[PDB]
């Protein structure tokens, strides 16, 4: 089962407004939350909710995947603030990232500075070394599940496979579960291996969103074509007009052999190196 702790919130002190989209167990809402920052009567939050209808399993496997935020500390991944396991429906509240996701940015921009394109990477860099010191594997890292603050801050996150404006990024392979194909390693593709060294190829695809303003990767391949060309050892073409630095450090995260990809601590040092 799932223990309530001291993370608990009382049900009242949080008020749903809008809608941010469809999530993986239920719909996700902004709101505003009492009490749970210190110093600070209101915070502005993310609502996170499990369908009325999903059993008392999936209620239990959406609580145990909010529990690892628990451990985290890192200002570029999305916090924590709050759970409500006590009575329906069951909500887990976060730090509400008010300008949206990152992929849902670039596309409202569509002339970024290598300053700017290079201070976003370094910042989503930090979250994921953070993640990955501490053994999370994230497996779904793109430009839609970065989240992006008022300050204009980037901070990793998740928001599940299931909205239906990223329905194109997402490949029902074998009739099975979503794949994100067009993010996804050689190895992730053929033997269905995810590790930091997977994650860092998808970085180097996020790197591609950035200096693209989100075009679709492989755009003109289908998803059977996806497999084929990067399991072969293809890669995507650099952008137009992209800097020679941030297509550089795309290469460096497209190694076919992952143990010759950067770290992301190694990305955050190269990235230090140029500052
Ligand atoms: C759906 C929801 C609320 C959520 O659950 N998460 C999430 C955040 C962090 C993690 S985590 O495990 O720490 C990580 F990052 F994957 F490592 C998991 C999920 C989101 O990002 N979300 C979108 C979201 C959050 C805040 N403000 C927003 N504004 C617009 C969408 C939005
Ligand atoms: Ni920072
Ligand atoms: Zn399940």
Not at 40 to 46: L, Q
Not at 78 to 85: E, F, I, N
Not at 130 to 140: E, G, I, M
Request: aromatic letters at 10%.
């Amino acid at each position: 089962v799932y223990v309530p702790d001291e993370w608990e919130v009382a049900r009242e002190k949080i008020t749903m407004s809008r809608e941010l989209g469809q999530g993986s167990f239920g719909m996700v809402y902004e709101g505003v939350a009492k009490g749970v920052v210190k110093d600070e009567p209101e915070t502005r939050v993310a609502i996170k909710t499990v369908n009325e209808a999903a059993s008392m399993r999936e209620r239990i496997e959406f609580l145990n995947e909010a529990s690892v935020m628990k451990e985290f500390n890192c200002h570029h991944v999305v916090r924590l603030l709050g759970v409500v396991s006590q009575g329906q429906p069951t909500l887990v509240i976060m730090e509400l990232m008010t300008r949206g996701d990152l992929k849902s940015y670039l596309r409202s921009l569509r002339p970024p500075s290598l300053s700017k394109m290079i201070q976003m990477a370094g910042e989503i860099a930090d979250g994921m070394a953070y993640l990955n010191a501490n053994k999370f594997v994230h497996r779904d890292l793109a430009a839609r599940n970065c989240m992006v603050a008022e300050d204009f801050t980037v901070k990793i996150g998740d928001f599940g496979m299931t909205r239906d404006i990223y329905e194109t990024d997402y490949y029902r392979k074998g009739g099975k579960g979503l794949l994100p194909v067009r993010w996804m390693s050689p190895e992730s593709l053929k033997d269905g291996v995810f590790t930091t060294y997977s994650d860092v190829w998808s970085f180097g695809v996020v790197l591609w969103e950035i200096a693209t303003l989100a075009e679709q990767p492989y755009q003109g391949l289908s998803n059977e074509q996806v497999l084929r060309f990067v399991m072969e050892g293809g890669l995507l073409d650099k952008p137009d007009n992209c800097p020679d630095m941030l297509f550089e450090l795309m290469r460096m995260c497209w190694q076919y052999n992952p143990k010759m990809r950067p770290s992301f601590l190694e990305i955050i040092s190269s990235i230090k190196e140029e500052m």
